Amino acid sequence: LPPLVPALYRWKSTGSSGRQVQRRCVGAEAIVGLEEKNRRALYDLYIATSLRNIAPASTLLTLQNLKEMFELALLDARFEHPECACTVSWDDEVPAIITYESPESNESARDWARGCIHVQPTAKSALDLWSEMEEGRAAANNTPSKSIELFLLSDVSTDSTPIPQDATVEILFHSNHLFWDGIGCRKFVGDLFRLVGSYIGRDSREMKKIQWGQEIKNLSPPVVDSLKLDINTLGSEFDDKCTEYTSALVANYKSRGMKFQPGLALPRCVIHKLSADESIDIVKAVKTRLGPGFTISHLTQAAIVLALLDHLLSDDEVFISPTSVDGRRWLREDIASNFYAMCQTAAVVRIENLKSITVSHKDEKELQVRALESACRNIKKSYRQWLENPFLQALGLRVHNFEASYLHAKPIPFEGEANPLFISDGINERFIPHEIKQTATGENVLSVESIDFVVNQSLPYLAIRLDSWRDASTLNIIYNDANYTEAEVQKYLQSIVEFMLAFRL
């Protein structure tokens, strides 16, 4: 297994002015950056936010003036976090190249921001537009997505129609996954919602010009150089643990699992929003039944497994799932909480003795609870083997480099069957505010009602995401519609939800 490598991934000035820098991407970046996949938007991130106009009656909003305010916000945000204007290129190597260049002029910067914000008077939701964009893609037939763009939608006649009191404005954020992980992208949405507050109800042309060039130092530093651990100190324990992961990875590609139909078509999504009341009861049941260190994310992973067992093989089968985790805790404290580029690593969930946890929905509640509890303890114990290790972020970078190379070499890496994968997105309040306010007055202007986070799926496994907003948990399953019917995914999602609900006290 090739080593890191830190020098290989640092920012480099590409010319005399210092205004353009580039770096070879690393780890999970290399996976989502694979040229043949990135050009087809195969891992693109979308965040669908539904907002409600709760502003004072004297605040006049239109799609046209919202676009103007978000252009201003996006410029401020580019200064704070220039990942939003990085671009991608490739040579003959597997890892993508990430470039950042300061705007050549304030005019050029303004042109760029205008180019990233779009509006439509329409009744379509943000997710309706995702569907349309993916259908349109696809039909249009090979250019990588921008780091970020926004689409503002509202059911009004024109872009100068005042948005009625309590009317919905939807925003779809669309990002090339190369330049962010889910955390960084949501943090950036939060930043835009903060920054746009400066421009509601005002002389923006007269405001202090941004000194372009000065934001280069605001790019997230290279992950390798940001670690607590000195990677030069690594040895055979590190190599063995990396090999344990890559062995699990390769075996997961080849393992028995959920049947799928071969092919490739469009990414699709099925969403189940649990009520706040249900979510609070589920979280309480986890705390009570299982205690500290256990979470609804563990329970969801447990329910995924029980739903899989109920849906379906060898006596000694082990459920093995190479998952990804946020790597920020492995970064130095003064970097870790302000990191917008990809910062992901890897763990392997393992659950043995599947027969002992095989329960139907018609079995006694106590049997189901006991099965879920067993699985949760297996899940948490698994994570412990990975998360307690100080080299884990370094391992992620190294093994994900390998994974990118594997996926380049094997474009159809699953055959016949693929087990569902769980991704926890966590609590959205960490990153995005409940309201957009007029900053000068503190007045609420737009209520952020719902947040749905989607990542395009071009591989044949069910990718199951959990997050939370306003104390309500949402489960989303993203799948490719060549591989499953919507009905079977819905059936599976409902099964997972039913087991989660069964855990309630």
Short mmCIF file of C-alpha atoms in Angstrom, two decimals:
data_model
loop_
_atom_site.label_atom_id
_atom_site.label_comp_id
_atom_site.label_asym_id
_atom_site.label_seq_id
_atom_site.Cartn_x
_atom_site.Cartn_y
_atom_site.Cartn_z
CA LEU A 1 0.00 0.00 0.00
CA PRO A 2 1.59 3.34 -1.05
CA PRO A 3 2.42 5.74 1.85
CA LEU A 4 1.69 9.43 2.46
CA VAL A 5 3.37 11.60 1.08
CA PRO A 6 2.58 14.95 2.83
CA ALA A 7 4.69 17.17 0.53
CA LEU A 8 2.71 15.88 -2.46
CA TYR A 9 -0.49 17.59 -1.20
CA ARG A 10 0.49 21.10 -0.12
CA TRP A 11 -0.66 24.33 -1.72
CA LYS A 12 1.82 25.59 -4.38
CA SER A 13 1.92 29.01 -6.11
CA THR A 14 1.74 28.41 -9.87
CA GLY A 15 3.30 31.73 -10.96
CA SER A 16 5.08 34.92 -9.91
CA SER A 17 2.13 36.93 -8.60
CA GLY A 18 1.13 34.38 -5.96
CA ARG A 19 -2.55 34.89 -6.94
CA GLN A 20 -3.01 31.27 -8.14
CA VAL A 21 -2.30 28.20 -5.97
CA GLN A 22 -2.89 24.52 -6.64
CA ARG A 23 -2.72 21.20 -4.81
CA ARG A 24 -2.95 17.51 -5.62
CA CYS A 25 -6.09 16.22 -3.90
CA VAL A 26 -5.83 13.51 -1.21
CA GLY A 27 -7.84 10.77 0.46
CA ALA A 28 -11.61 10.94 0.00
CA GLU A 29 -11.08 13.85 -2.43
CA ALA A 30 -9.45 11.44 -4.88
CA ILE A 31 -12.54 9.21 -4.81
CA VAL A 32 -15.05 11.96 -5.61
CA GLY A 33 -12.54 13.67 -7.93
CA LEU A 34 -12.02 10.66 -10.29
CA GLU A 35 -12.22 12.36 -13.67
CA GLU A 36 -14.68 9.91 -15.28
CA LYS A 37 -17.07 10.28 -12.30
CA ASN A 38 -16.59 13.95 -11.44
CA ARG A 39 -17.27 14.94 -15.09
CA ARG A 40 -20.61 13.12 -14.78
CA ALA A 41 -21.42 14.69 -11.38
CA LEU A 42 -21.54 11.20 -9.88
CA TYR A 43 -20.88 12.36 -6.27
CA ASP A 44 -22.31 15.92 -6.42
CA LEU A 45 -23.72 17.37 -3.17
CA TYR A 46 -27.10 19.07 -3.01
CA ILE A 47 -28.66 20.77 0.01
CA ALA A 48 -32.38 21.59 -0.31
CA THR A 49 -33.57 24.22 2.14
CA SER A 50 -37.22 25.26 2.39
CA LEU A 51 -37.64 28.72 3.86
CA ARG A 52 -40.72 30.70 4.86
CA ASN A 53 -41.12 34.46 4.61
CA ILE A 54 -41.68 35.51 8.24
CA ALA A 55 -40.38 39.03 7.78
CA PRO A 56 -42.00 42.24 9.09
CA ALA A 57 -44.68 43.32 6.59
CA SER A 58 -42.53 46.34 5.65
CA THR A 59 -39.72 44.07 4.36
CA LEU A 60 -40.09 43.64 0.60
CA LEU A 61 -38.57 40.46 -0.81
CA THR A 62 -38.45 39.44 -4.45
CA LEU A 63 -36.50 36.73 -6.27
CA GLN A 64 -34.55 39.51 -8.01
CA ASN A 65 -33.55 41.27 -4.76
CA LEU A 66 -32.85 37.94 -2.99
CA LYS A 67 -30.46 37.06 -5.80
CA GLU A 68 -28.81 40.46 -5.35
CA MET A 69 -28.39 39.92 -1.56
CA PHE A 70 -27.03 36.37 -2.00
CA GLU A 71 -24.53 37.59 -4.59
CA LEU A 72 -23.24 40.05 -1.98
CA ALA A 73 -23.21 37.33 0.70
CA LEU A 74 -21.40 34.92 -1.63
CA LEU A 75 -18.64 37.47 -2.23
CA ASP A 76 -18.15 37.90 1.53
CA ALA A 77 -18.23 34.12 1.89
CA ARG A 78 -15.59 33.66 -0.84
CA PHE A 79 -13.33 35.93 1.19
CA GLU A 80 -13.91 33.92 4.38
CA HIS A 81 -13.86 30.47 2.72
CA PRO A 82 -12.49 30.43 -0.84
CA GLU A 83 -13.27 26.73 -1.31
CA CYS A 84 -16.49 28.05 -2.91
CA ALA A 85 -14.48 29.13 -6.01
CA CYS A 86 -11.84 26.42 -6.32
CA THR A 87 -11.78 24.63 -9.68
CA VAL A 88 -10.74 21.16 -10.78
CA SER A 89 -8.38 19.82 -13.42
CA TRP A 90 -6.72 16.55 -14.20
CA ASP A 91 -3.63 15.11 -15.71
CA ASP A 92 -3.07 11.41 -16.32
CA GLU A 93 -2.96 10.53 -12.61
CA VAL A 94 -5.98 9.35 -10.65
CA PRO A 95 -6.05 12.23 -8.09
CA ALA A 96 -7.66 15.46 -9.25
CA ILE A 97 -5.88 18.80 -9.00
CA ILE A 98 -7.55 21.57 -7.00
CA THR A 99 -6.80 25.14 -8.02
CA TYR A 100 -7.66 28.47 -6.41
CA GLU A 101 -7.11 31.86 -8.08
CA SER A 102 -7.97 35.27 -6.60
CA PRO A 103 -10.30 37.38 -8.77
CA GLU A 104 -8.30 39.52 -11.23
CA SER A 105 -10.50 42.48 -10.30
CA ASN A 106 -13.48 43.36 -8.16
CA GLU A 107 -15.59 43.35 -11.39
CA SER A 108 -14.47 39.78 -12.22
CA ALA A 109 -15.38 38.69 -8.68
CA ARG A 110 -18.82 40.23 -9.03
CA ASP A 111 -19.27 38.50 -12.41
CA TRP A 112 -18.33 35.21 -10.76
CA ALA A 113 -20.87 35.61 -7.88
CA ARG A 114 -23.67 36.65 -10.26
CA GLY A 115 -22.90 33.48 -12.26
CA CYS A 116 -23.46 31.29 -9.20
CA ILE A 117 -26.89 32.54 -8.09
CA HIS A 118 -30.02 31.70 -10.09
CA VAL A 119 -33.72 32.32 -9.64
CA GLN A 120 -36.95 30.80 -10.95
CA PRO A 121 -40.56 31.85 -10.38
CA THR A 122 -42.00 28.34 -10.07
CA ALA A 123 -44.06 26.01 -7.89
CA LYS A 124 -41.35 23.29 -8.04
CA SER A 125 -39.59 22.38 -4.80
CA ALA A 126 -35.79 22.34 -4.39
CA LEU A 127 -35.81 18.52 -4.70
CA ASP A 128 -38.04 18.73 -7.81
CA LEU A 129 -35.31 20.87 -9.33
CA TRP A 130 -32.63 18.37 -8.30
CA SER A 131 -34.60 15.71 -10.20
CA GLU A 132 -34.86 17.98 -13.23
CA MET A 133 -31.16 18.85 -13.16
CA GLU A 134 -30.14 15.22 -12.91
CA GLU A 135 -32.52 14.26 -15.73
CA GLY A 136 -31.22 17.23 -17.79
CA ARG A 137 -27.53 16.29 -17.11
CA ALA A 138 -27.66 13.17 -18.40
CA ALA A 139 -29.69 13.96 -21.51
CA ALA A 140 -27.32 16.88 -22.33
CA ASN A 141 -24.37 14.47 -22.35
CA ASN A 142 -19.25 15.86 -19.43
CA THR A 143 -18.30 19.05 -17.56
CA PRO A 144 -17.51 19.10 -13.75
CA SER A 145 -19.86 21.05 -11.52
CA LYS A 146 -18.97 24.38 -9.98
CA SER A 147 -17.80 24.31 -6.37
CA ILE A 148 -21.14 25.88 -5.40
CA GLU A 149 -24.22 27.36 -7.01
CA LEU A 150 -27.63 28.38 -5.55
CA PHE A 151 -31.12 28.28 -7.05
CA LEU A 152 -33.83 30.41 -5.41
CA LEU A 153 -37.36 29.28 -6.18
CA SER A 154 -40.70 30.73 -5.17
CA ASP A 155 -44.25 30.26 -6.44
CA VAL A 156 -44.76 33.83 -7.67
CA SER A 157 -45.53 35.20 -11.15
CA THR A 158 -42.25 36.97 -11.88
CA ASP A 159 -38.86 37.73 -10.33
CA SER A 160 -40.07 41.18 -9.22
CA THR A 161 -43.28 39.88 -7.62
CA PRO A 162 -43.23 40.56 -3.84
CA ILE A 163 -42.96 37.27 -1.98
CA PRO A 164 -46.12 37.11 0.15
CA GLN A 165 -46.04 36.91 3.95
CA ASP A 166 -45.68 33.20 4.89
CA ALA A 167 -44.90 32.14 1.34
CA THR A 168 -42.16 29.54 0.83
CA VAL A 169 -38.85 30.32 -0.83
CA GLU A 170 -36.83 27.17 -1.62
CA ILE A 171 -33.08 27.20 -2.10
CA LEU A 172 -31.20 24.36 -3.76
CA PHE A 173 -27.44 24.44 -3.13
CA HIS A 174 -25.49 22.38 -5.61
CA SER A 175 -21.81 21.59 -5.00
CA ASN A 176 -19.04 19.62 -6.62
CA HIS A 177 -18.13 17.18 -3.83
CA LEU A 178 -14.39 17.59 -4.57
CA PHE A 179 -14.16 20.87 -2.60
CA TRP A 180 -16.12 19.93 0.53
CA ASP A 181 -17.36 17.22 2.73
CA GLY A 182 -20.95 17.34 4.01
CA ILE A 183 -19.81 19.24 7.10
CA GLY A 184 -17.89 21.88 5.20
CA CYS A 185 -20.71 22.40 2.70
CA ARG A 186 -23.37 22.78 5.42
CA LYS A 187 -21.08 25.13 7.39
CA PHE A 188 -20.82 27.22 4.23
CA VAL A 189 -24.65 27.30 3.79
CA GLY A 190 -24.77 28.53 7.44
CA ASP A 191 -22.22 31.23 6.61
CA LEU A 192 -24.30 32.44 3.64
CA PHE A 193 -27.41 32.63 5.88
CA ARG A 194 -25.43 34.72 8.38
CA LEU A 195 -23.78 36.95 5.73
CA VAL A 196 -26.92 37.65 3.70
CA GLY A 197 -28.41 39.29 6.86
CA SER A 198 -26.05 42.24 6.32
CA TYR A 199 -27.83 43.15 3.06
CA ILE A 200 -31.52 42.87 3.85
CA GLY A 201 -33.15 46.32 3.97
CA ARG A 202 -30.18 48.47 2.87
CA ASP A 203 -26.04 51.30 -0.07
CA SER A 204 -24.15 48.08 -0.84
CA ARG A 205 -22.44 49.70 -3.85
CA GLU A 206 -20.68 52.07 -1.41
CA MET A 207 -19.37 49.40 0.95
CA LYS A 208 -15.66 48.72 1.40
CA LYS A 209 -14.17 46.88 -1.60
CA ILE A 210 -12.78 43.44 -0.88
CA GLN A 211 -8.98 43.33 -1.20
CA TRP A 212 -8.82 40.23 -3.41
CA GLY A 213 -5.64 38.25 -2.84
CA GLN A 214 -5.99 38.53 0.92
CA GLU A 215 -8.34 35.51 1.02
CA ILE A 216 -5.69 33.01 -0.18
CA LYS A 217 -4.55 32.55 3.42
CA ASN A 218 -8.19 31.68 4.29
CA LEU A 219 -8.17 28.47 2.24
CA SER A 220 -8.36 25.45 4.57
CA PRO A 221 -4.80 24.26 5.15
CA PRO A 222 -3.66 20.88 3.78
CA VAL A 223 -5.18 18.16 5.95
CA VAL A 224 -1.85 16.27 6.28
CA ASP A 225 -0.07 19.31 7.78
CA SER A 226 -3.03 20.03 10.06
CA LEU A 227 -2.93 16.80 12.05
CA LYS A 228 -2.04 16.47 15.68
CA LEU A 229 -0.01 13.38 14.76
CA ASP A 230 3.36 13.61 13.01
CA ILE A 231 2.87 11.08 10.18
CA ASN A 232 6.64 10.42 9.91
CA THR A 233 6.36 8.57 13.21
CA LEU A 234 4.09 5.84 11.76
CA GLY A 235 5.20 2.20 11.50
CA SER A 236 3.94 -1.38 11.19
CA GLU A 237 0.83 -1.02 13.42
CA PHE A 238 -0.32 1.72 11.04
CA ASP A 239 0.44 -0.41 7.96
CA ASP A 240 -1.44 -3.40 9.42
CA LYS A 241 -4.50 -1.31 10.32
CA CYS A 242 -4.51 0.22 6.79
CA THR A 243 -4.34 -3.30 5.34
CA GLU A 244 -7.19 -4.39 7.62
CA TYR A 245 -9.30 -1.62 6.12
CA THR A 246 -8.35 -2.25 2.46
CA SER A 247 -8.96 -5.99 2.94
CA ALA A 248 -12.44 -5.23 4.38
CA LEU A 249 -13.08 -2.80 1.52
CA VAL A 250 -12.27 -5.28 -1.21
CA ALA A 251 -14.24 -8.04 0.52
CA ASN A 252 -17.25 -5.74 0.95
CA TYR A 253 -17.28 -5.26 -2.85
CA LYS A 254 -17.48 -9.07 -3.26
CA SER A 255 -19.77 -9.98 -0.36
CA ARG A 256 -23.27 -11.40 -0.38
CA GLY A 257 -25.96 -8.83 0.34
CA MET A 258 -29.04 -7.08 -0.99
CA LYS A 259 -29.81 -8.04 -4.58
CA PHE A 260 -29.79 -5.28 -7.19
CA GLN A 261 -30.37 -5.08 -10.93
CA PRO A 262 -27.25 -4.18 -12.91
CA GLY A 263 -26.86 -0.97 -14.89
CA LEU A 264 -26.61 2.80 -14.51
CA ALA A 265 -29.29 5.46 -14.77
CA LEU A 266 -30.36 8.39 -12.57
CA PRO A 267 -29.80 9.13 -8.86
CA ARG A 268 -33.01 9.13 -6.88
CA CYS A 269 -34.02 9.73 -3.28
CA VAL A 270 -36.67 8.43 -0.84
CA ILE A 271 -37.13 10.50 2.34
CA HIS A 272 -38.88 9.71 5.64
CA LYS A 273 -39.13 12.57 8.08
CA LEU A 274 -39.76 11.32 11.61
CA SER A 275 -41.86 13.76 13.66
CA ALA A 276 -40.06 15.70 16.38
CA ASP A 277 -42.15 13.74 18.93
CA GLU A 278 -41.03 10.39 17.50
CA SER A 279 -37.44 11.54 17.26
CA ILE A 280 -37.34 12.77 20.83
CA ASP A 281 -38.84 9.46 22.03
CA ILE A 282 -36.25 7.47 20.02
CA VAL A 283 -33.35 9.53 21.44
CA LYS A 284 -34.77 9.09 24.97
CA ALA A 285 -35.01 5.31 24.45
CA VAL A 286 -31.36 5.17 23.32
CA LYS A 287 -30.23 7.12 26.41
CA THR A 288 -32.35 4.98 28.76
CA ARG A 289 -31.80 1.55 27.23
CA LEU A 290 -28.19 1.98 26.21
CA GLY A 291 -26.79 5.05 27.95
CA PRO A 292 -23.86 7.43 27.39
CA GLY A 293 -21.86 7.03 24.20
CA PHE A 294 -24.84 5.53 22.35
CA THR A 295 -26.75 7.52 19.76
CA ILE A 296 -29.65 7.43 17.37
CA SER A 297 -26.98 6.94 14.65
CA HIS A 298 -26.01 3.60 16.26
CA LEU A 299 -29.68 2.67 16.46
CA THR A 300 -30.22 3.57 12.81
CA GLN A 301 -27.29 1.38 11.77
CA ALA A 302 -28.79 -1.44 13.90
CA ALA A 303 -32.21 -1.02 12.24
CA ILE A 304 -30.57 -1.06 8.79
CA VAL A 305 -29.06 -4.47 9.62
CA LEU A 306 -32.28 -5.90 11.10
CA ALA A 307 -34.22 -4.65 8.04
CA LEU A 308 -31.61 -6.31 5.80
CA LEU A 309 -31.83 -9.63 7.71
CA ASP A 310 -35.63 -9.45 7.56
CA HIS A 311 -35.48 -8.71 3.79
CA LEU A 312 -33.19 -11.66 3.01
CA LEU A 313 -26.82 -15.92 4.26
CA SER A 314 -23.96 -18.25 5.35
CA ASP A 315 -24.09 -19.46 8.96
CA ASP A 316 -20.84 -17.67 9.81
CA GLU A 317 -21.64 -14.52 7.82
CA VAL A 318 -20.43 -11.26 9.29
CA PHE A 319 -22.05 -7.94 8.48
CA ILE A 320 -19.05 -5.82 7.56
CA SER A 321 -19.42 -2.23 6.43
CA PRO A 322 -16.53 0.15 5.65
CA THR A 323 -18.03 3.47 6.71
CA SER A 324 -16.71 7.04 6.60
CA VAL A 325 -16.41 9.40 9.57
CA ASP A 326 -15.68 13.08 10.15
CA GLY A 327 -11.91 13.39 10.76
CA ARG A 328 -11.87 16.84 12.30
CA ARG A 329 -11.08 15.62 15.84
CA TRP A 330 -7.66 14.47 14.53
CA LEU A 331 -6.75 18.02 13.47
CA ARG A 332 -5.05 20.55 15.74
CA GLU A 333 -7.59 22.40 17.92
CA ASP A 334 -7.15 25.82 16.26
CA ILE A 335 -7.83 24.35 12.80
CA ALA A 336 -10.41 21.63 13.62
CA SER A 337 -13.48 23.84 14.11
CA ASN A 338 -12.93 25.99 11.00
CA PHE A 339 -12.15 23.39 8.26
CA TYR A 340 -14.24 23.45 5.08
CA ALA A 341 -12.40 21.11 2.70
CA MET A 342 -12.95 17.31 2.86
CA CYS A 343 -11.85 15.92 6.21
CA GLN A 344 -12.98 12.31 6.28
CA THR A 345 -11.65 9.00 7.43
CA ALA A 346 -12.76 5.40 7.69
CA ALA A 347 -13.91 2.71 10.16
CA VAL A 348 -15.25 -0.81 9.74
CA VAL A 349 -18.54 -1.76 11.36
CA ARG A 350 -18.73 -5.49 12.18
CA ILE A 351 -21.68 -7.47 13.48
CA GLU A 352 -21.28 -11.23 13.97
CA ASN A 353 -23.92 -13.83 14.96
CA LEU A 354 -26.55 -12.46 12.65
CA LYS A 355 -28.96 -15.32 13.38
CA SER A 356 -29.16 -14.28 17.06
CA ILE A 357 -30.37 -10.78 16.04
CA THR A 358 -32.71 -11.88 13.20
CA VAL A 359 -36.16 -10.67 14.27
CA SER A 360 -39.32 -9.99 12.34
CA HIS A 361 -41.62 -7.01 12.77
CA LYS A 362 -44.24 -9.46 14.11
CA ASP A 363 -41.93 -10.78 16.87
CA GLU A 364 -42.45 -9.71 20.49
CA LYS A 365 -41.37 -6.11 21.13
CA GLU A 366 -38.88 -7.29 23.76
CA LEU A 367 -37.22 -9.60 21.19
CA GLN A 368 -36.84 -6.68 18.75
CA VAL A 369 -35.48 -4.35 21.46
CA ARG A 370 -32.95 -6.99 22.54
CA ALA A 371 -31.85 -7.58 18.94
CA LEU A 372 -31.47 -3.81 18.35
CA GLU A 373 -29.55 -3.43 21.63
CA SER A 374 -27.18 -6.30 20.67
CA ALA A 375 -26.53 -4.78 17.27
CA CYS A 376 -25.94 -1.29 18.77
CA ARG A 377 -23.37 -2.70 21.21
CA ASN A 378 -21.60 -4.50 18.29
CA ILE A 379 -21.69 -1.26 16.26
CA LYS A 380 -20.31 0.94 19.05
CA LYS A 381 -17.61 -1.63 19.89
CA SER A 382 -16.59 -1.74 16.19
CA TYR A 383 -16.29 2.03 15.97
CA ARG A 384 -14.13 1.99 19.12
CA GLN A 385 -11.51 -0.19 17.35
CA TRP A 386 -11.10 2.59 14.83
CA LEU A 387 -11.98 5.88 16.47
CA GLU A 388 -9.73 5.48 19.53
CA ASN A 389 -6.67 5.31 17.30
CA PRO A 390 -4.59 8.51 17.02
CA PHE A 391 -3.52 7.72 13.44
CA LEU A 392 -7.08 7.34 12.11
CA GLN A 393 -7.14 10.49 9.93
CA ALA A 394 -3.78 9.55 8.39
CA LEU A 395 -5.20 6.05 7.72
CA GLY A 396 -8.28 7.54 6.00
CA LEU A 397 -6.14 9.56 3.61
CA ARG A 398 -4.00 6.55 2.74
CA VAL A 399 -6.78 4.00 2.34
CA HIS A 400 -9.03 6.39 0.43
CA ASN A 401 -6.15 7.04 -1.98
CA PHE A 402 -6.19 3.27 -2.51
CA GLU A 403 -9.97 3.22 -2.86
CA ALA A 404 -9.90 5.89 -5.60
CA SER A 405 -7.35 3.85 -7.54
CA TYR A 406 -9.45 0.68 -7.05
CA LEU A 407 -12.57 2.44 -8.33
CA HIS A 408 -10.74 3.81 -11.35
CA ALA A 409 -9.54 0.28 -12.18
CA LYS A 410 -12.95 -1.27 -11.47
CA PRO A 411 -15.86 0.84 -12.78
CA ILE A 412 -18.38 -1.94 -11.90
CA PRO A 413 -16.99 -2.97 -8.50
CA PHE A 414 -20.19 -4.57 -7.14
CA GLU A 415 -21.76 -7.54 -8.95
CA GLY A 416 -25.22 -8.95 -8.22
CA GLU A 417 -25.45 -7.85 -4.55
CA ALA A 418 -24.41 -4.86 -2.44
CA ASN A 419 -25.09 -4.15 1.19
CA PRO A 420 -26.64 -0.82 2.23
CA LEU A 421 -24.27 1.82 3.56
CA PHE A 422 -25.06 4.15 6.47
CA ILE A 423 -23.92 7.78 6.56
CA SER A 424 -24.66 9.93 9.60
CA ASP A 425 -24.97 13.67 8.80
CA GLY A 426 -25.78 14.55 12.45
CA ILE A 427 -27.55 17.60 13.84
CA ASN A 428 -27.94 20.42 11.33
CA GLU A 429 -28.08 23.10 14.08
CA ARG A 430 -24.32 22.65 14.42
CA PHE A 431 -23.94 24.37 11.06
CA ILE A 432 -27.06 26.22 9.84
CA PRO A 433 -29.17 28.77 11.72
CA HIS A 434 -32.92 28.44 12.33
CA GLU A 435 -33.49 31.89 10.80
CA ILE A 436 -32.05 34.39 8.40
CA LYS A 437 -32.21 37.76 10.23
CA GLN A 438 -31.75 41.41 9.27
CA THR A 439 -28.51 41.77 11.19
CA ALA A 440 -28.94 45.49 12.03
CA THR A 441 -32.32 44.97 13.69
CA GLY A 442 -32.25 41.35 14.82
CA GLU A 443 -35.60 40.84 13.03
CA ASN A 444 -36.34 37.39 11.62
CA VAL A 445 -36.80 37.51 7.88
CA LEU A 446 -36.75 33.90 6.61
CA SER A 447 -37.44 30.82 8.73
CA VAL A 448 -35.35 27.79 7.76
CA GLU A 449 -38.09 25.13 7.94
CA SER A 450 -36.53 22.03 6.44
CA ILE A 451 -33.14 20.82 5.32
CA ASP A 452 -32.56 17.83 3.05
CA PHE A 453 -29.01 16.77 2.23
CA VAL A 454 -28.52 14.62 -0.85
CA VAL A 455 -25.37 13.15 -2.45
CA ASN A 456 -25.76 11.75 -5.96
CA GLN A 457 -25.54 7.94 -6.09
CA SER A 458 -24.09 6.17 -9.14
CA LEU A 459 -23.16 2.90 -7.37
CA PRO A 460 -25.62 0.06 -6.79
CA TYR A 461 -25.90 0.16 -2.96
CA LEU A 462 -28.56 1.92 -0.94
CA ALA A 463 -26.92 4.90 0.71
CA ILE A 464 -28.83 5.75 3.86
CA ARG A 465 -28.32 9.13 5.47
CA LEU A 466 -29.56 10.37 8.87
CA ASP A 467 -29.70 13.92 10.07
CA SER A 468 -31.70 16.15 12.35
CA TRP A 469 -33.30 19.58 12.26
CA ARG A 470 -35.57 21.26 14.85
CA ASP A 471 -35.42 18.00 16.88
CA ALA A 472 -36.81 15.92 14.01
CA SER A 473 -34.73 13.13 12.43
CA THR A 474 -34.90 12.56 8.68
CA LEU A 475 -33.79 9.34 6.98
CA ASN A 476 -32.96 9.60 3.30
CA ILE A 477 -32.05 6.71 1.04
CA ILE A 478 -30.28 7.66 -2.14
CA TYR A 479 -30.09 5.03 -4.84
CA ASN A 480 -29.60 4.72 -8.53
CA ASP A 481 -32.85 3.92 -10.35
CA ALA A 482 -31.19 1.42 -12.68
CA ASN A 483 -30.53 -0.77 -9.64
CA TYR A 484 -33.72 -0.60 -7.57
CA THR A 485 -37.36 0.29 -7.94
CA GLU A 486 -38.71 3.17 -5.84
CA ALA A 487 -41.17 0.71 -4.26
CA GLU A 488 -38.48 -1.63 -2.96
CA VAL A 489 -36.46 1.28 -1.48
CA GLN A 490 -39.59 2.67 0.16
CA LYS A 491 -40.38 -0.81 1.56
CA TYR A 492 -36.85 -1.08 2.94
CA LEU A 493 -36.91 2.49 4.38
CA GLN A 494 -40.24 1.82 6.10
CA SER A 495 -38.80 -1.38 7.61
CA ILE A 496 -35.85 0.52 9.05
CA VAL A 497 -38.20 3.18 10.45
CA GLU A 498 -40.47 0.55 11.99
CA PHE A 499 -37.55 -1.06 13.87
CA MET A 500 -36.35 2.34 15.13
CA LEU A 501 -39.85 3.09 16.39
CA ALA A 502 -39.99 -0.32 18.04
CA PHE A 503 -37.11 0.74 20.29
CA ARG A 504 -39.27 3.40 21.97
CA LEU A 505 -39.91 2.98 25.68
#
